[PDB]
Amino acid sequence: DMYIERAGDITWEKDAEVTGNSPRLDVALDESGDFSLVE
Amino acid sequence: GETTDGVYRVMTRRLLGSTQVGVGVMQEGVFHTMWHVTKGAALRSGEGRLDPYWGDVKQDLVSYCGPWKLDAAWDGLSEVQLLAVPPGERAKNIQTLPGIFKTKDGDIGAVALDYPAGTSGSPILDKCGRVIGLYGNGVVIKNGSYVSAITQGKRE
Ligand SMILES: COc1ccc(-c2ccccc2C(=O)Nc2cnn(C)c2)cn1
């Protein structure tokens, strides 16, 4: 049985940790809502 | 029940201890998460009950108490922030430039940040603090890391 707890406000924060790349990927979306790589 | 706007943890006691299965966004009295986190089950907030209102396994979204409210979109240029809420760890903003999921039905923003499965439902923000989508549905890549769509619903 699932419950929710508040974890914070939704705010943009100036000077957060800036990380991650920006990959361009060919993907398929099936009827179950699973993405997959089309190569 | 607590109906204040903000980000929330989704928890179960059906396993060992209290386990975090995902995250969601309360806005305008509606709770928003990803389908794979709740499987469309009802939710408790204190003594209050949240019943599902709208959902779609293919979009992998679900709303509680009311229709989908989040209509903001990635502009396809500007950096964004993943307001990650990992299991047992404080809310933390992580700023990134999204890549692109190319599909037959069109292009979608993607964020390449690696967090436990229980972080599914964490919101992605634009510069004005508006939710442009939820983190937690995408693909495992050549490397082995995770890339998530920026998944957004339609507002009617
Ligand atoms: C199999 O290895 C893993 C481990 C973890 C993840 C993962 C990582 C970040 C955010 C969400 C997820 C996640 O679980 N998404 C998802 C979508 N649909 N279902 C059923 C689960 C994906 N793959």
What CATH number does residue B36 fall under? 2.40.10.120
* Residue B20 near residue B121, CB atoms below 8 Å: no
Question: Residue B84: which CATH number?
Answer: 2.40.10.10
Q: Are residues B57 and B89 in the same domain?
A: no
What residues contact residue B58 under an 8 Å CB cut-off, 6+ apart? Answer: A29, A31, A32, A33
Question: Is A29 near chain B, with CB under 8 Å?
Answer: yes
From residue A5, how far is each of A39, B25, B55, B98, B103 by CA, in Å? 41, 11, 21, 28, 35
Among residues B153, B103, B145, the alpha carbon closest in space to that of B124 is found at: B153
Is B138 inside any structural domain?
Answer: yes
* Residue B152 near residue B123, CB atoms below 8 Å: no
- Give me the domain span that covers residue B84: 80-149
Please report residues of A whose CB lies closer than 8 A to that of B96.
18-20, 22
Among residues B114, B95, B77, the alpha carbon closest in space to that of A19 is found at: B95
How many residue contacts between A and B have a Cβ separation below 8 Å?
Answer: 154
**Residue B134: how many CB atoms within 10 A of its CB?**
28
Q: How many domains does chain B have?
A: 2
Instruction: DSSP for chain B, please give it.
Output: ----SEEEEEEESSSSSSEEEEEEEEETTEEEEEHHHHTT--EEETTEEE-EEEEETTTTEEEESSS--------SSS-EEEEE--TTS--EEEEE--EEEEETTEEEEEE-----GGGTT-EEE-TTS-EEEES--EEE-SSS-EEEE-B-PPP-
Please report residues of A whose CB lies closer than 8 A to that of B4.
6
Q: Are residues B12 and B39 in the same domain?
A: yes
Q: Are residues B33 and B84 in the same domain?
A: no
- Rounded distance, CA B132 to CA B139, Å? 19
Q: What is the resolution of this structure in A?
A: 1.7
* Residue B97 near residue A20, CB atoms below 8 Å: yes
Q: Which two tokens stand for residue B115?
A: 């967090």
3-class DSSP state of A36: strand
Among residues A31, A37, A4, A33, the alpha carbon closest in space to that of B36 is found at: A33
Is B156 inside any structural domain?
Answer: no
- Per the annotation, the verdict on B120 as an active-site residue is yes
Query: C-alpha A14: how far from its chain's center?
Result: 20
Distance between A30 CA and the closest CA of chain B, angstroms? 7
Q: Which of B32, B63, B120, B122 is catalytic?
A: B120
CA terminus-to-terminus distance, chain A: 40
- Rounded distance, CA B89 to CA B99, Å? 26
Residue of B nearest to A22 (CA): B99
Experimental method: X-ray
* Residue B21 near residue A2, CB atoms below 8 Å: yes
Pairing assessment for the beta strands A2-8 and B6-12 based on DSSP bridges: antiparallel
* Residue A12 near residue B129, CB atoms below 8 Å: yes
Is B154 inside any structural domain?
Answer: no
Going B14 to B20 to B21 to B25, the CA torsion angle's sign is: positive
Is B72 inside any structural domain?
Answer: no
What residues contact residue A36 under an 8 Å CB cut-off, 6+ apart? Answer: A27, A28, A30, B139
* Rg value, chain A, Cα: 17
Instruction: Compute, in angstroms, the gap from residue B36 CA to the centroid of ligand 1.
Output: 9
Among residues B1, B3, B25, the alpha carbon closest in space to that of B122 is found at: B25
- Rounded distance, CA B88 to CA B43, Å? 20
